[PDB]
DNA sequence: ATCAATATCCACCTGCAGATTCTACCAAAAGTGTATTTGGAAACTGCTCCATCAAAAGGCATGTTCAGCGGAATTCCGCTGAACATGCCTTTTGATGGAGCAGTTTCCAAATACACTTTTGGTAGAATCTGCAGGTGGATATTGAT
DNA sequence: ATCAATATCCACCTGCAGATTCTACCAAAAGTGTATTTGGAAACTGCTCCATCAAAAGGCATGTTCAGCGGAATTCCGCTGAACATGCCTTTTGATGGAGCAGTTTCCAAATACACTTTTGGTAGAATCTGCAGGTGGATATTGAT
């Protein structure tokens, strides 16, 4: 039985970008491997940051520095934007 | 008719850099995998997907080592990669340090 | 032999994908020896994961986890 | 405070990312915005590769994205290539490329 | 700020009774211990998760040691580890 | 009795067990874990100290310094691998000149 | 602060090639080396300083540098890690 | 009649000398300004614990000395004895630093 | 420059392995609401140590001269890989029992959580202890000129 | 080979900075001792999917031929290493003042902890569909020969 995967949310995103393009299974498998990988690297660094600073909590602040530390210049620029935006919109909504 | 040496090679290069199929035959490979593992633990069964991953990894590894090797041969103003060229590459990669 | 089962044509096919035009004669034997060390390193690790899980079957994840700590992360077969 | 992903305006599972952050043993506690921020970062990066891979596929008279198309999108992008600098994409092959000195003398 | 210094010293004295260690060296020994400590626990940590186990036991620790250390070092490390666990298991 | 004595060890078992918790590696830690990990830590510092100790002797020294540590690690196949990506401050490199660089013949 | 890279003199860069076992040195090496050291420092200091900021500190500590180095796979023993 | 060592003799003396010691080989102060220059012109108003400046120098020299060994190997591969920029470059390329 | 031999490109075709679509079951999710707990920011602030200014001096960087030798260019040529056609042996493919990999249930040794009590390793700090760096000289190699 | 200029080796000697030696204090830490909770081993078991196999299938092993690669021998130029004079700026020793790291205490916005409630993503079994991979064909670019 039971095996989660980012496969559907990947597919949803694939449609806001290439509404008429589709993806093969082996490919989806790679995108899933891609998300889990980034997830871990970002989480891990967040983890370390907190520990270095003697903190029990991983916040978006930690997630942010982690992205800074993890991603290449321009890619990290957008990543921060996207991220700050999602937290803003979220907070400003019951 | 006859093609000059190197002509068919570049043809072979252009062709293989276009494709993604594996270049080692599955059976001989699987045999080599099981053999090597038999020294780590007797009576082992391999998921077909596990052997597949090992092969996908192995080839991707060699294909890259051959790139760096080609770069070492070229560095020495040659066009044919040699054992020393692999040797120098693995050494700079830390696979020997 | 098994390591001899990984043949010249195939080793030459690989070199090609890597941009190699001319191949010396002693490469093939060198290539294998390297392929051997590669697999012995990765499998050993993968097989350690198999035992920890108390299984008799090396799984694709067992390999993926070994490859990752070898620094050879592979996408497509799990995790 | 709603379906969290919808609130953040995201396609990724803000609730699942949060669940995985905890089950992951990264810290004793996990703030409320961290999973939102992190899910936003994943989704964006996901769009980025799919965006480039789509182009990769179209540019081959193909409508469905396969590994090769993911590999081409990645290694042809300076930054992605960097991020996945120590990653192997199964069935991706390599970029066409012949060392100049090896081409027949024109 | 805790160290490992008195323990490194104790062990120093066991192997080389008449030798000392400069503080800069004691410092490198401290980084060494903390390093291997993290490496092993990390390996231990992931091993647990890959296996959906919520507990790190001497068994994960031992696999992590096998996963992390080179051949001969590992054999000996694994031996000292089992030996200690067994003895601690038989004592209070 | 300290758990170190019960385990027959010099390294502080409690301290380790404790550091395992604060480090967040899993929801729980067996008591056998810190015992084993302190044994392995202690064995490792003994091995490097045995070899550093000799390096100092070989240099007519009594107090071990970083360079000795470096010599012991770089001269030992396995310690060298275990520490293949570690830089021991103030340790230098091992003396070593390539053959082709030495003068004369034979 | 300006042109400080030129403070990595030819004599010093030469001393380093020596410990590295290098016997003879071509003329363009000194600038090639300065450029390389420059990138090395930019990479470790950026990460180092990212750690400083995250800690809302104004002083770059040895641990900041030690963590940046560990990040870059260049782990250093001797300064708090 | 003046005595004069042939080219390469002193060079080997230096290799034997430096490979035997462990003191940093770049001037303390000059290296510090370079650090502050780079740090500052990437975020201003920063201060440095003396030991943070020493760890960067310890990491930097250990990095470069190892780089020179690889470079020396690449030169020898090309049957030369004097290292060139192209050697440093081949080494960083394979090391996966520029690729 | 002129064929002749091939390899490559491309527009069209289509059968099917794999992608898509529909429908219903359901436990693990994820959201909601309540009650309690607490991490860590804020504000007051001790005190560590960073930036910095001063000053004297020799260890090193700089810049020059000059000649030796390293490396690039070039000609040779011995021999080794690349291309190719010849012929069969090993890999591939689709097919069939059965071994383990998982799904499910039990219950027990062992792991929290909590309340005390005792052992200990950091440490602020005055005080004597000691391995050896750095200076010395003078008997032993190592170079390089002849 | 023999000689002479020089750097190397090294055992002795001694200053001094860094290491070792406690006295007294202690908070947190490691240990002792119930009480309560539960992770995951141990055993039974269904059912995937892995090992084995025979037969349709498609490389690869083999020996000849020679094109061209790479290492050897040679040569000349100019760049780099040694040696040297000179004087700069790094190193060293010290002390000053203050920014800022880091400790201590106060306290609320946010996080943990259930537990009731609603929702969803993953799985299974079935039928329908479609991007495209091999296949064909004939035009044409490329390569090698004369």
Short mmCIF file of C-alpha atoms in Angstrom, two decimals, chain A residues 2 4-6 9-10 12-14 16-18 20-24 26-27 30-31 34-35 37-44 47 50-51 55-60 63-64 67 70-76 78-87 89-91 93-94, chain D residues 1-2 4 6-14 16-17 19-21 25-38 40-55 57 62-67 70 77 79-80 82-84 87 89-91:
data_model
loop_
_atom_site.label_atom_id
_atom_site.label_comp_id
_atom_site.label_asym_id
_atom_site.label_seq_id
_atom_site.Cartn_x
_atom_site.Cartn_y
_atom_site.Cartn_z
CA UNK A 2 0.18 3.88 0.61
CA UNK A 4 2.61 9.98 -1.15
CA UNK A 5 4.35 12.02 -3.87
CA UNK A 6 4.41 15.57 -5.25
CA UNK A 9 1.03 19.34 -7.47
CA UNK A 10 3.81 19.08 -10.01
CA UNK A 12 -0.92 21.36 -11.49
CA UNK A 13 2.10 23.63 -11.85
CA UNK A 14 2.96 22.20 -15.23
CA UNK A 16 0.01 27.21 -15.40
CA UNK A 17 3.23 27.10 -17.38
CA UNK A 18 2.66 24.85 -20.37
CA UNK A 20 -0.75 22.12 -23.60
CA UNK A 21 2.39 20.19 -22.64
CA UNK A 22 2.31 16.85 -20.83
CA UNK A 23 4.80 14.78 -18.84
CA UNK A 24 5.98 11.16 -18.97
CA UNK A 26 9.78 8.60 -15.71
CA UNK A 27 9.88 12.36 -15.92
CA UNK A 30 12.45 12.89 -11.64
CA UNK A 31 10.42 15.96 -10.63
CA UNK A 34 13.72 16.91 -7.47
CA UNK A 35 11.25 18.29 -4.93
CA UNK A 37 15.87 16.71 -2.78
CA UNK A 38 15.38 20.49 -2.54
CA UNK A 39 13.04 19.97 0.38
CA UNK A 40 15.76 18.08 2.33
CA UNK A 41 18.58 20.45 1.51
CA UNK A 42 16.49 23.46 2.50
CA UNK A 43 15.17 21.79 5.64
CA UNK A 44 18.57 20.54 6.68
CA UNK A 47 17.87 22.82 10.96
CA UNK A 50 18.55 26.99 14.30
CA UNK A 51 21.03 24.77 16.15
CA UNK A 55 16.89 27.92 18.78
CA UNK A 56 14.20 25.27 19.08
CA UNK A 57 12.22 26.62 16.13
CA UNK A 58 12.55 26.57 12.37
CA UNK A 59 10.69 29.63 11.07
CA UNK A 60 10.32 31.16 7.62
CA UNK A 63 13.80 28.89 5.62
CA UNK A 64 14.85 32.19 4.05
CA UNK A 67 17.42 29.53 0.57
CA UNK A 70 21.40 27.14 -0.84
CA UNK A 71 20.40 28.70 -4.15
CA UNK A 72 22.41 30.45 -6.93
CA UNK A 73 22.17 34.25 -7.05
CA UNK A 74 19.26 35.04 -9.34
CA UNK A 75 17.40 31.82 -8.62
CA UNK A 76 17.62 32.70 -4.91
CA UNK A 78 13.07 34.91 -7.01
CA UNK A 79 12.86 32.15 -4.44
CA UNK A 80 12.84 34.74 -1.66
CA UNK A 81 10.27 36.84 -3.44
CA UNK A 82 7.92 33.91 -4.04
CA UNK A 83 8.38 32.84 -0.46
CA UNK A 84 7.86 36.22 1.15
CA UNK A 85 4.76 36.64 -0.98
CA UNK A 86 3.16 33.33 0.02
CA UNK A 87 3.65 34.14 3.72
CA UNK A 89 -0.82 36.62 1.47
CA UNK A 90 -1.34 33.84 3.98
CA UNK A 91 -1.01 35.99 7.12
CA UNK A 93 -6.25 36.26 5.47
CA UNK A 94 -8.53 34.83 8.21
CA UNK D 1 -6.22 31.32 9.18
CA UNK D 2 -8.18 28.48 5.73
CA UNK D 4 -3.61 26.62 3.90
CA UNK D 6 -5.22 28.28 -0.95
CA UNK D 7 -4.63 31.01 1.65
CA UNK D 8 -0.96 31.35 0.65
CA UNK D 9 -2.21 31.10 -2.92
CA UNK D 10 -0.15 28.06 -3.74
CA UNK D 11 -0.49 24.83 -5.67
CA UNK D 12 1.81 22.95 -3.33
CA UNK D 13 0.50 21.24 -0.16
CA UNK D 14 1.30 23.76 2.57
CA UNK D 16 1.97 18.37 3.84
CA UNK D 17 5.16 20.38 3.78
CA UNK D 19 3.75 17.72 8.31
CA UNK D 20 6.99 16.61 6.70
CA UNK D 21 8.99 19.38 8.42
CA UNK D 25 13.33 16.03 13.13
CA UNK D 26 14.85 19.35 12.08
CA UNK D 27 13.85 21.27 15.20
CA UNK D 28 11.69 20.89 18.32
CA UNK D 29 9.20 23.44 16.99
CA UNK D 30 8.16 24.68 13.56
CA UNK D 31 6.72 28.14 12.98
CA UNK D 32 3.50 28.65 11.03
CA UNK D 33 5.02 30.55 8.14
CA UNK D 34 7.92 28.21 7.53
CA UNK D 35 5.86 25.59 5.74
CA UNK D 36 4.21 28.30 3.65
CA UNK D 37 7.54 29.90 2.74
CA UNK D 38 9.11 26.54 2.00
CA UNK D 40 6.29 28.51 -2.04
CA UNK D 41 10.01 27.98 -2.73
CA UNK D 42 9.51 24.44 -3.94
CA UNK D 43 6.65 25.33 -6.28
CA UNK D 44 8.55 28.20 -7.79
CA UNK D 45 11.58 26.01 -8.45
CA UNK D 46 9.27 23.38 -9.87
CA UNK D 47 7.74 25.84 -12.30
CA UNK D 48 11.21 26.99 -13.29
CA UNK D 49 12.43 23.57 -14.44
CA UNK D 50 9.07 22.59 -16.02
CA UNK D 51 9.01 25.98 -17.74
CA UNK D 52 12.43 25.38 -19.31
CA UNK D 53 11.75 21.68 -20.02
CA UNK D 54 8.55 22.61 -21.86
CA UNK D 55 10.58 24.87 -24.13
CA UNK D 57 10.23 19.73 -25.65
CA UNK D 62 7.30 17.23 -28.93
CA UNK D 63 4.38 17.90 -26.61
CA UNK D 64 5.20 15.53 -23.77
CA UNK D 65 8.19 16.15 -21.49
CA UNK D 66 10.58 13.25 -21.01
CA UNK D 67 13.83 12.99 -18.96
CA UNK D 70 14.53 17.82 -18.15
CA UNK D 77 20.81 26.78 -17.50
CA UNK D 79 21.98 28.37 -12.19
CA UNK D 80 19.91 25.18 -12.29
CA UNK D 82 24.78 24.64 -10.52
CA UNK D 83 22.05 23.61 -8.09
CA UNK D 84 21.91 20.14 -9.60
CA UNK D 87 22.83 15.25 -9.50
CA UNK D 89 19.01 12.62 -14.08
CA UNK D 90 18.36 9.07 -15.23
CA UNK D 91 17.78 8.75 -18.96
#
